[PDB]
Curated annotation (Swiss-Prot), chain A:
Protein species of origin: Homo sapiens
Protein known as: Transient receptor potential cation channel subfamily M member 4
Effect of L219 to A/C: Abolishes ability to restore sensitivity to Ca(2+) after desensitization
Location of region: Mediates modulation by decavanadate and PIP2-binding: 920-925
Name of encoding gene: TRPM4
Quaternary assembly: Homotetramer.
Residues in the Extracellular compartment per record: 603-613, 682-683, 749-760, 782-816
Function per UniProt: Calcium-activated selective cation channel that mediates membrane depolarization. While it is activated by increase in intracellular Ca(2+), it is impermeable to it. Mediates transport of monovalent cations (Na(+) > K(+) > Cs(+) > Li(+)), leading to depolarize the membrane. It thereby plays a central role in cadiomyocytes, neurons from entorhinal cortex, dorsal root and vomeronasal neurons, endocrine pancreas cells, kidney epithelial cells, cochlea hair cells etc.
Amino acid sequence: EQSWIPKIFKKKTCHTTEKPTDAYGELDFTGAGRKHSNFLRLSDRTDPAAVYSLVTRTWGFRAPNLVVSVLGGSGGPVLQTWLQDLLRRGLVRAAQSTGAWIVTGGLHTGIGRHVGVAVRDHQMASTGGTKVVAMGVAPWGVVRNRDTLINPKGSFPARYRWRGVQFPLDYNYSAFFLVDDGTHGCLGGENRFRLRLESYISQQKTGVGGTGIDIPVLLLLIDGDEKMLTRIENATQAQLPCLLVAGSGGAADCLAETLEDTRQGEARDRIRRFFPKGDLEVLQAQVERIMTRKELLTVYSSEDGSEEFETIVLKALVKACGSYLDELRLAVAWNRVDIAQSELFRGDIQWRSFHLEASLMDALLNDRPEFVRLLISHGLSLGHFLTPMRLAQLYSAAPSNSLIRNLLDQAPWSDLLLWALLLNRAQMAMYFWEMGSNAVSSALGACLLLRVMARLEPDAEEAARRKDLAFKFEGMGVDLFGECYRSSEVRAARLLLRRCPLWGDATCLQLAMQADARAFFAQDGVQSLLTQKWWGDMASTTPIWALVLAFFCPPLIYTRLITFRRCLRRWFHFWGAPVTIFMGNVVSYLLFLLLFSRVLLVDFQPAPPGSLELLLYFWAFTLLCEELRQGLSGGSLASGGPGPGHASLSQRLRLYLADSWNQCDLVALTCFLLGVGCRLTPGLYHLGRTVLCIDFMVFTVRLLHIFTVNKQLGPKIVIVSKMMKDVFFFLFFLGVWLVAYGVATEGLLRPRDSDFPSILRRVFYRPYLQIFGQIPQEDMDVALMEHSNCSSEPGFWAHPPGAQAGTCVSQYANWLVVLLLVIFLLVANILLVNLLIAMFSYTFGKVQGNSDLYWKAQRYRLIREFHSRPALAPPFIVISHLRLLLRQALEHFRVYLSKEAERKLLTWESVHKENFLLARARDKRESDSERLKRTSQKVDLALKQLGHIREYEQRLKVLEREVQQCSRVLGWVAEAL
Amino acid sequence: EFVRLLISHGLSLGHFLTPMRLAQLYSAAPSNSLIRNLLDQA
């Protein structure tokens, strides 16, 4: 695998030399575990920046937040029980709450064996995730079995054997640094590597960018021995780390007594420690070098036990700093919320503004969404916070390298909302939308921007998040509009249609259209607005017959029947509505078909053409012109199309030829041109008629695409195209079963008059008309024909009475023909047709629910097409094109309001939004599964408070017994002596 | 339910599983008709 490890890191032998390093790789214990632990042999006096870069970069460890270092020696008996409680409650629960490390002498049977027991017990007790990591620094020279690790290329698994002064390696850790100095069995022979590593960690920033704090580090000592004071004084003189001294040990309680003062030093150095030591420098150096400063040391409380440990750590680590680190930035660097809870809600110290204003910047970068609610709820106003230098700094952080970094390689709340939407943070984005201003338009725009940016990234793990976040925004927008349509439908109609300035001159509905949001058109209020849009200017659900009677006679609109200086505006309002230009288009098209039929049936003689064909040619030229206008005027940004504004001719040409109906009309026009050019040349008169009669069919079948808009045929026309998965199955099965019957029948009868078309006819075409109730039996039997022998081959022959069935049919074994007829009719008639009915029913009942939604989506585009179309008939399309080429959507697409009504309307909707979110939150709060959780927490609290009451009865009974004994003794000395 | 406890915070199985032990474990046959009948041929 890697090979730079024996290139950089060195080792030493038996005043010594330097060589490349062997014996490295992963290590495996044949036990219950989820990973193989890493180890490395390395030489002393190496720059620890390299080994820190090794641990962070190559191996999969995350950069730490807190480095504690257990540093003591008990000598190896079993410890008393409350020390086990301390290491089992305080240095493991805190160490997996925050992502932390534990640096320990990594051998077995040392102080670290108890640490391993505590880690193992806490993993075996419960599973809360994020298993406790630990490194082990140990000297090469006391490990029991060598020669199963050392190999010059290296072993990636390594089986390890305990049985087969030395020590084994413990099996609880995840990293093994083996320092070497050159010896065999010198315990306690490497410390300066450990001190320089511990010191190098505390000058390195945390987080992604270098913004926040330096990593805190602390040395925790329970009882040691007579040389541990040197280890204390080296660190606390050199690098200023905060210390912590566990009370009631046996070699650090001397420091507790000499710090609790604020010669007796000889009284202390022989009472709370090993009395044979030699009072020569221990009283002077190994106490005075420690007690020359006291802002660093801290006595841990012996009367106050566990469940307060990180509070004591936090207080000591703040206190020793002032010999700028604060409390909130350290809390945000961890993930604990309750520390911020107590610090904010506690009324002992009034909080300033600079602390919050600085710490919010560190909260936004490392994606801690639960803290921003606290830091902005009872804190600062954001108008003080957001400054353009700060926002430039926030954009300046780029946490990834491929999404916004690649899109910048080419280069107040909504400003944060775009920032949250670019970098894929869900729990930030919901909060910034909920504290937003323009409610409904922002949701659909967010859905649009996610659907666009989902394409450019390569992976699928990103797309499975982007599509889900887009569905979440679309659903939230749908429910918000549904909770506003309930009251004052005029207000909702005014809200939906208007223009939102934050994204340019675009409306809400067009943004919903270009992102393909089905569920937003799915609901009913949008449908009821599109209905009134489609009835045009000033009509309301007048029936159809009034419209037809108005369109037939123009002096009936000035009267009572229509329902809504004066007349010349009334006449312009009536013909502007789309439901009238639709009727005009349909009437013109039917007149075109009737004229074409009267040309084809009676006329179209071999002659010079005349007026009744020149009218048709003029008509076809106008239809080609209108098709060219629709094509050139110009699709869907959700696919990745070129979008509005300007695009290429090579883009619009590719766009236009993908929708099938215009492709069919183009084919129809070219076939029409082929026929009408065929005719003008002489000598090919018949072929023009033959082509043009077929092309009439393709002109006629387009009369279904026009009626897609209407209400009662809309969801019915679309389903017919999705039922083409079964007609092909029917044709396959029937063709295979049909050809065999045809060949077998014409083999048994043997007609003695044969050609190619007669045989092809009598094999295919005659069985095909037998499944539709036409069964002629004249050519099948012989017992209906005349026994006539006119044939020359030997046998017996019969004469058919019909036509096309030859003139001679054999009679040998004629009953097989009748039996095959019965078999074929029973198969095709009784099984296949009924099976096809069953398949249509089962396909329809499934696909109906999707087809209805897809029809509801496209109705807006089909309405929008008709308004841009010219308002005159194809007999007046020359004058409409004259008005178009004389100077070379507005209705129900922009409503302009007064700004006081705008400012009122946004308040009206913001009230409903703030009501809606609170209603949903309280409905989740008062459910029937969170009652159980709060009762669980309250019963746990009650049990914990009940745990204090028990010992008071024991101590109070003991004290009352002592008072009774003292009263008995005083009464004895008074009245008994 | 005991083997999780005796192997979780206990020994490594590379020490435990030895071929004499595994022969002893196969040597126990709790039934008389399924593996006993299929070792009647062996």
